Ligand binder design. Structure first.
Ligand code: BCL
Ligand code: BCL
Ligand SMILES: CC[C@H]1c2cc3[nH]c4c(c3C)C(=O)[C@H](C(=O)OC)c4c3nc(cc4[nH]c(cc(n2)[C@@H]1C)c(C(C)=O)c4C)[C@@H](C)[C@@H]3CCC(=O)OC/C=C(\C)CCC[C@H](C)CCC[C@H](C)CCCC(C)C
Ligand SMILES: COC(C)(C)C/C=C/C(C)=C/C=C/C(C=O)=C/C=C/C(C)=C/C=C/C=C(C)/C=C/C=C(\C)CC/C=C(C)/C=C/C=C(\C)C(=O)O
Ligand SMILES: COC(C)(C)C/C=C/C(C)=C/C=C/C(C=O)=C/C=C/C(C)=C/C=C/C=C(C)/C=C/C=C(\C)CC/C=C(C)/C=C/C=C(\C)C(=O)O
Ligand SMILES: COC(C)(C)C/C=C/C(C)=C/C=C/C(C=O)=C/C=C/C(C)=C/C=C/C=C(C)/C=C/C=C(\C)CC/C=C(C)/C=C/C=C(\C)C(=O)O
Ligand SMILES: COC(C)(C)C/C=C/C(C)=C/C=C/C(C=O)=C/C=C/C(C)=C/C=C/C=C(C)/C=C/C=C(\C)CC/C=C(C)/C=C/C=C(\C)C(=O)O
Ligand SMILES: COC(C)(C)C/C=C/C(C)=C/C=C/C(C=O)=C/C=C/C(C)=C/C=C/C=C(C)/C=C/C=C(\C)CC/C=C(C)/C=C/C=C(\C)C(=O)O
Ligand SMILES: COC(C)(C)C/C=C/C(C)=C/C=C/C(C=O)=C/C=C/C(C)=C/C=C/C=C(C)/C=C/C=C(\C)CC/C=C(C)/C=C/C=C(\C)C(=O)O
Ligand SMILES: COC(C)(C)C/C=C/C(C)=C/C=C/C(C)=C/C=C/C(C)=C/C=C\C=C(C)\C=C\C=C(C)\C=C\C=C(C)\C=C\CC(C)(C)OC
Ligand SMILES: CCCCCCCCCCCCO[C@@H]1O[C@H](CO)[C@@H](O[C@H]2O[C@H](CO)[C@@H](O)[C@H](O)[C@H]2O)[C@H](O)[C@H]1O
Ligand SMILES: CCCCCCCCCCCCO[C@@H]1O[C@H](CO)[C@@H](O[C@H]2O[C@H](CO)[C@@H](O)[C@H](O)[C@H]2O)[C@H](O)[C@H]1O
Ligand SMILES: CCCCCCCCCCCCO[C@@H]1O[C@H](CO)[C@@H](O[C@H]2O[C@H](CO)[C@@H](O)[C@H](O)[C@H]2O)[C@H](O)[C@H]1O
Ligand SMILES: [Fe+3]
Lengths: 49, 39, 315, 71, 49, 49, 40, 39, 60, 71, 40, 60, 40, 60, 39, 49, 40, 49, 39, 39, 40
């Protein structure tokens, strides 16, 4: 399976994979913060009355 | 570009990295599930 | 056509010479000290106008492009007369007008110095001086009537709004005889350049476009040019003197124009009534007739100040 | 720093510098002369506590009027 | 059947296939999130009263 | 029958056929979701009041 | 250029087989769909 | 100038691209019709 | 029919084709966007029965 | 398909493509920005149910005689 | 150039295997989804 | 990816890029400055809960 | 001069990959835009 | 990092930079001077608690 | 006229400067977001 | 795994990593000050009535 | 150009050491933060 | 560890570090003066009633 | 054009002059913020 | 053009003239401030 | 073309020293500030 990398550049592959992971992770967290009501419960715990 | 021997070294670390990432993410999801299960 | 030559070393002894014609440097587009200052002063004038226009749409860059031809930097309010106005009410206008005027005069100096450096006659700066004269009457006529409010707004359609309203205020500018003369020279300039351009192209096969050679050493191209017009209309110019006819018709356009503006509002306030006095106005049958009661009823008021309150009518 | 004059001809720089300082000083004097607070030719003799403050309204004067009386 | 790949570039094949899979999966998830009322029932669970 | 393929290129044939199938299948599903009351009955099954 | 007769013989065999597989799958899909919601 | 060998290969792509474009446009029209028909 | 590409240069035609299609597509989208019926940026979420329709004949 | 790059200069097609995509992207953003439903800089914080929607066919006689707004 | 027959031979094996793996994971996904919220 | 700089002279690319970015950034700032919600020179101190919002649907 | 065919294959491979990568991020942009404010 | 000055003539880059910054400084000062909150020649002596804000007064 | 050595060298700065620019823009956006969200 | 660094320049790596760390740290602090009600409690401690 | 393997091996050792040291300091910071204001 | 400085100019390093510290310190003091209410309490101590 | 060391000398002045100007502008904003904050 | 030591000489006058001009401008501003402050 | 390794070895030692000095002065500053107005 390793033959798939032949003729590719490691720094291209890591730059592409890095850009994907950063994008995916940020999208997932911002989506998750909307659904799970967190940090909104964290903020409420320490908010001033 | 990478030769077949270079590609073999790269593949080994790439598989190792991918697997380790999925392992850490699996622990993250078990922790998240135990905290606020979503189904 | 479509056998262009291309010259690798410098023509003037594509490309261009770096060198001198005596005092005159060749190569770069000549500025000198007067040209540099002209661009600095003129740039600030352009910036003040554009920033005021852009501020007037609330800095909205879409509206700045969409509404651009309607935008204005507008002269001061009338009741200030010649006094300094508030910055937002014509203070920026007078500032842009000042820097533009300096920039124009510095450009005239730049052209005058360059003509002398190239060892040329002074004809071009005096032609440009005729255009500057007309421009300056848009300062001097507001000065002579006593209010900067009468100046021309900076703006594409706004300066055309002013052009119409000026003719309206002073009772139809068609009856200003210097406006009429200025039009005759404007049309004559188009007549002459059509005739002359067509004449030289009609003899270009015979080397007629080499006009300086044809002036110094009359060829058959010059002779045929003279005979065409002599045979057509009974008189002719020469290869030199047709350029004097050209020069004077262009120059007299803006010169007679400037006199017409300076006379307006200072000597004559209603050009149609001046036309009636001097016999210019053709008679037409009356379209309506007023009774003596209507002559008092239908007189209006001169326009006053805008209402500075929002009345309630509570009754 | 002196090598700036080896990169740029000082004969050209001084004309641009003088031009820049000229327009800048003239802009600032005309701005102030059109202000309420600093229109010093009309109001320069007023004391600091008598001079206008906060007069930033865009239409402080009537826009529309006849010309002032001719004589 | 493998003969079908002859004369192709395998990086182009993996690029085209991967780009289809991204597009298809995103359309399917928007659609599924609409039909199944999820994560809308997730958000409702942890929402503040 | 196979003589019809002579002078063709197999990638051209597979790309043309693949295009037509993707078109036909999408049109048929869009149509089917209009006539059959599905996924509309699915959506109503899990919708909240 | 283009595909020869012996290539076309081989290509045709797979093309027929793929089409039959597709029709078999589609037949099950319609039998399930008919069982689920008859349209006539 | 071009050979017939190249013209053959070009026309294959050209016609296939025309078909792919017509296919996509047909799906686009049926989607638009399903959303808001014009007859 | 590929002999037509011995008459006309692919270089010239494929540019002219892309240009014509791009212009035609853009003209149609802006024609529709300017209509009431298909002003889809404002009204795209209206159902087909809710969308505008031009005036019918009164016949009376 | 790669032989298209023998037919056209691969250096110049890239400039043509990026220029096209930039103009199209700007055009679509400015079309949206001038709309009411997608004037996102003013109304982006609205939820989808409360975002504007264009006018609809009255779905009725379009004839029912009015009643005044309550004083 | 593009793939030779021998490259294509072993490419096809991995491509088939990857596709079957993808289908296997999706099959589990649908089984869980059906258990959670069935749609017919 | 660095071979791309063999195909395009970076003297040309960076001048075009810097020009594009500067113009785009200025356009975006002025689009914001002329909006109600982001006219920050006049209203930047307000605080998010009392900054303007464009009108919700007329059907409200 | 012109483009050699092995360079054209290298260039095509990048060009197609770049095009598809652009379409992929545009796909996510539409996914986000649709879930914020759908247009149908 | 200095090889940027082998690629471009610094004699031109400095003129472009100086011209850009001069224009940018002029634009920013003009925008502020045109505002109400930062009309500093007329209102610069106001304390920040009574400088203008781009909001309407409560309850009129 | 770039050599491949100079092109490699230049690209490292171009990537780095782009990353620095994107980082500053990312902080600027999160400051703007936390002061006045646009969604 | 050190082979990833071959062909790179250490100053470019430090510039890249240093930029990311500055950005990540600041975003995390701007976010955390919003959730934890600090320094808002600090400011209230020393404010004047 | 740039880094040789021997330079890379040497560089990597400090890079690992820095990364671990940064993680250690951050771990103390989080322990202090948690004991000050727990977030779950 | 020292050889990260190789190939660099010490005057640029000191210029970058120096200008960073000026900006950071000014930001920190402006922020701190806001939270800690100082010099506001200094001004009030000596202000004329 | 320039020699490489001649560019290296210029870069020293250019960088230091830029950062000097940014430092002066930083204090200008410190004074403006103390006089009339914009957020 | 101009030699380096000739540039050094000219620079000394430019520094001196700039300083003298800034001094006069500083007195002008402090006179103006004492007459009618702008903050 | 900048610092050679022995210049860098020299420069590093001073940079370490200056950084330690800065941090030490700042540590006294934070100790004094904590005594004056503690922030947790
Ligand atoms: C309803 C409108 C009125 C009217 C109102 C006016 C008014 C008002 C004026 C004219 C004037 C003129 N009109 Mg009239 N005019 C009308 C009907 C006509 C008709 C027609 C067929 O009906 C014609 C042919 C004309 C023709 C003419 C010209 C003969 C004459 C301008 C000469 C010239 O060259 O100006 C163009 C040349 C200039 C303006 C000179 C400019 C030179 C300067 C130095 C250029 C500086 C450029 C600067 C550096 C660039 C940067 C600028 C910044 C961007 C701001 N009018 C009717 C009756 N007309 C003018 C005149 O002379 O009146 C007697 C005049 O002022
Ligand atoms: C001369 C070679 C280096 C230099 C060498 C030093 C040295 C050596 C020291 C500093 C110090 C400082 N420098 Mg430094 N510094 C340079 C350029 C700059 C620039 C800039 C815009 O380029 C800035 C903003 C700074 C800023 C700073 C501060 C972070 C710091 C505190 C003192 C201070 O600011 O004094 C005002 C300084 C400036 C605004 C810079 C311009 C002034 C002169 C030309 C250069 C620095 C003089 C230095 C401060 C005097 C040190 C006296 C010692 C007893 C030897 N430097 C130049 C390029 N800098 C000191 C420090 O670390 O304190 C913690 C320190 O010991
Ligand atoms: C005989 C009458 C006619 C006439 C004649 C005429 N006009 C003339 C001349 C003549 C003979 C000139 O020689 C003169 C000329 O230069 O012609 C090319 C000119 C001219 N007629 C002009 C316009 C003009 N003439 C008009 C009309 C007429 N011109 C009449 C019909 C009109 C009309 C009909 O409205 C116009 C608009 C100008 C093109 C030109 C005079 C140019 C001039 O004065 O420019 C002053 C400078 C500026 C406006 C500033 C420009 C700023 C830059 C765009 C900024 C760029 C940045 C800058 C580099 C920053 C600074 C950095 C420094 C370090 C450099
Ligand atoms: C709702 O209202 C309206 C819409 C009106 C209702 C009406 C609808 C109508 C009218 C529908 C009609 C539909 C229709 C009509 O024809 C439908 C026809 C469908 C067809 C034909 C489907 C065929 C599918 C075939 C497939 C998938 C083949 C796959 C092949 C494979 C896997 C083999 C791969 C290997 C190869 C190739 C060998 C390479 C070897 C090489 C190179 C070697 O050896 O060298
Ligand atoms: C408002 O209502 C109004 C509007 C007013 C009403 C009126 C409407 C009217 C009048 C409409 C008219 C429509 C029309 C009329 O013509 C419409 C005609 C449309 C047409 C023709 C579409 C054709 C599209 C073809 C395409 C996309 C081809 C793509 C080709 C590809 C992808 C191949 C790429 C690869 C190559 C080339 C490799 C070559 C190999 C090489 C080189 C090698 O191998 O060497
Ligand atoms: C909701 O309403 C509507 C939308 C209407 C509903 C309807 C929806 C419809 C109709 C859906 C249809 C979907 C569909 C239809 O086909 C979906 C088809 C899906 C498919 C096919 C998925 C296939 C995935 C394959 C994968 C992941 C393969 C990975 C391969 C790997 C990892 C190996 C890589 C390494 C290699 C190769 C070695 C190189 C060696 C080399 C080079 C060497 O050795 O040299
Ligand atoms: C109405 O809509 C509205 C509201 C407008 C919405 C908007 C919509 C749209 C359409 C937005 C579009 C955004 C966009 C794209 O599309 C945006 C694209 C942005 C991009 C690409 C940014 C890239 C920045 C990169 C930078 C800064 C790089 C700097 C590099 C430096 C400093 C190093 C230089 C080299 C050195 C030092 C080495 C020399 C060595 C040499 C020479 C040697 O060694 O030889
Ligand atoms: C709030 O909501 C949201 C935001 C959504 C929440 C989520 C947030 C998320 C997802 C966060 C993720 C963070 C993250 C992800 O990876 C974070 C990753 C962080 C990392 C990588 C840290 C790495 C630190 C490394 C350091 C400090 C290195 C120091 C090196 C030094 C000191 C010098 C080395 C020696 C040199 C140079 C000389 C060598 C010799 C040479 C050259 C020679 O000898 O030649
Ligand atoms: C309020 O809310 C928010 C803002 C969010 C809160 C959060 C804030 C955050 C996250 C802050 C982070 C701060 C930080 C993190 O690292 C801050 C880092 C600060 C640092 C690194 C300071 C370092 C200072 C170093 C100095 C002064 C060194 C001076 C050296 C000198 C004087 C020696 C010069 C002589 C030499 C070299 C010898 C030449 C020999 C030669 C040439 C030869 O021998 O050849
Ligand atoms: C950021 O940069 C931007 C984007 C803003 C740059 C872009 C700028 C743009 C887009 C600028 C657009 C400019 C346009 C469209 C201008 C149009 C101008 C037109 C059509 C003008 C037409 C006529 C104007 C006339 C005749 C004006 C005459 C003014 C005169 C003669 C004023 C003279 C004033 C004097 C001599 C002195 C005043 C000062 C005194 C002595 C009175 O002291 C107070
Ligand atoms: C900001 C981006 C975030 C979203 C994610 C974007 C993902 C982008 C995917 C990039 C994948 C690169 O993967 C692959 O790279 C190699 C080189 O490494 C390119 O390979 C190319 O050059 C090599 C030589 O080096 C040729 O032999 C090959 O034929 C050609 O295609 C491929 O064309 C590309 O498919
Ligand atoms: C990059 C170098 C240049 C920096 C230039 C200046 C940047 C400006 C932003 C820096 C941070 C501002 O920091 C913030 O300042 C405001 C100013 O009202 C303080 O605000 C607080 O104190 C001020 C004191 O006058 C009061 O008027 C105000 O009512 C109160 O809320 C905040 O408590 C502080 O957190
Ligand atoms: C108002 C105070 C704040 C603004 C300060 C503005 C001025 C800059 C302050 C630092 C001054 C010293 O700054 C330093 O000057 C020296 C020369 O003396 C420059 O040195 C430069 O030229 C010399 C030769 O003359 C070269 O050998 C060197 O490699 C090169 O960098 C440095 O690059 C610069 O960092
Ligand atoms: Fe002539």
């Amino acid at each position: 399976m390793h033959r798939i990398w032949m003729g590719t550049d490691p720094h291209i592959i890591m730059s592409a994979l890095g850009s994907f992971l950063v994008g995916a992770v940020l999208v997932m967290h911002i989506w998750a913060y909307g659904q799970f009501n967190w940090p909104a419960t964290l903020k409420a715990k320490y908010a001033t009355p | 570009g990478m030769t077949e021997e270079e590609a073999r070294r790269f593949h080994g670390y790439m598989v190792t990295g991918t697997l380790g990432y999925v392992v850490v993410a699996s622990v993250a999801h078990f922790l998240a599930w135990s905290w606020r299960p979503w189904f | 056509t479509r056998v262009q030559v291309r010259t690798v070393p410098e023509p003037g002894i594509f490309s261009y010479l770096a060198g001198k014609f005596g005092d005159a440097q060749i190569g770069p587009i000549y500025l000198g000290w007067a040209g540099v200052l002209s661009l600095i002063f003129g740039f600030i004038a352009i910036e003040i106008i554009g920033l005021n226009m852009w501020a007037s749409v609330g800095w909205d860059p879409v509206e700045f492009i969409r509404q651009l031809p309607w935008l204005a930097l507008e002269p001061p309010p009338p009741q200030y007369g010649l006094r300094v106005p508030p910055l937002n009410q014509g203070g920026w206008y007078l500032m842009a007008g000042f820097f533009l005027t300096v920039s124009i005069i510095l450009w005239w100096i730049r052209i005058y110095r360059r003509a002398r450096a190239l060892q040329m006659g002074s004809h071009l700066p005096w032609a440009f001086a005729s255009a500057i004269f007309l421009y300056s009457t848009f300062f001097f006529q507001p000065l002579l009537v006593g209010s900067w409010s009468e100046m021309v707004p900076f703006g594409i359609f706004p300066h055309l709004d002013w052009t119409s309203a000026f003719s309206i205020r002073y009772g139809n500018l068609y009856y200003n005889p210097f406006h009429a003369l200025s039009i005759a020279f404007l049309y004559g300039s188009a007549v002459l350049f059509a005739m002359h351009g067509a004449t030289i192209l009609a003899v270009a096969r015979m080397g007629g476009e080499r006009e300086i050679e044809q002036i110094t050493d009359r060829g058959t191209a010059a002779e045929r040019s003279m005979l065409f017009w002599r045979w057509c209309m009974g008189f002719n110019a020469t290869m030199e003197s047709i350029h004097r006819w050209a020069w004077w018709f262009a120059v007299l356009t803006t010169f007679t124009g400037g006199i017409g503006i300076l006379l307006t509002g200072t000597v004559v306030d209603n050009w149609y009534l001046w036309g009636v006095k001097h016999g210019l106005v053709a008679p037409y049958p009356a379209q309506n007739q007023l009774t003596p009661e209507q002559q008092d009823l239908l007189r209006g008021r001169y326009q006053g100040t805008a209402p500075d309150s929002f009345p309630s009518y509570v009754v | 720093m002196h090598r700036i004059w080896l990169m740029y001809d000082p004969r050209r720089v001084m004309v641009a510098l003088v031009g820049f300082l000229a327009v800048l000083a003239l802009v600032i004097h005309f701005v102030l002369l059109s202000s309420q607070r600093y229109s010093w030719i009309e109001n320069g003799t007023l004391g600091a506590d008598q001079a206008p403050v906060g007069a930033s309204a865009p239409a402080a004067a009537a826009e529309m009027s006849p010309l002032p009386p001719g004589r």
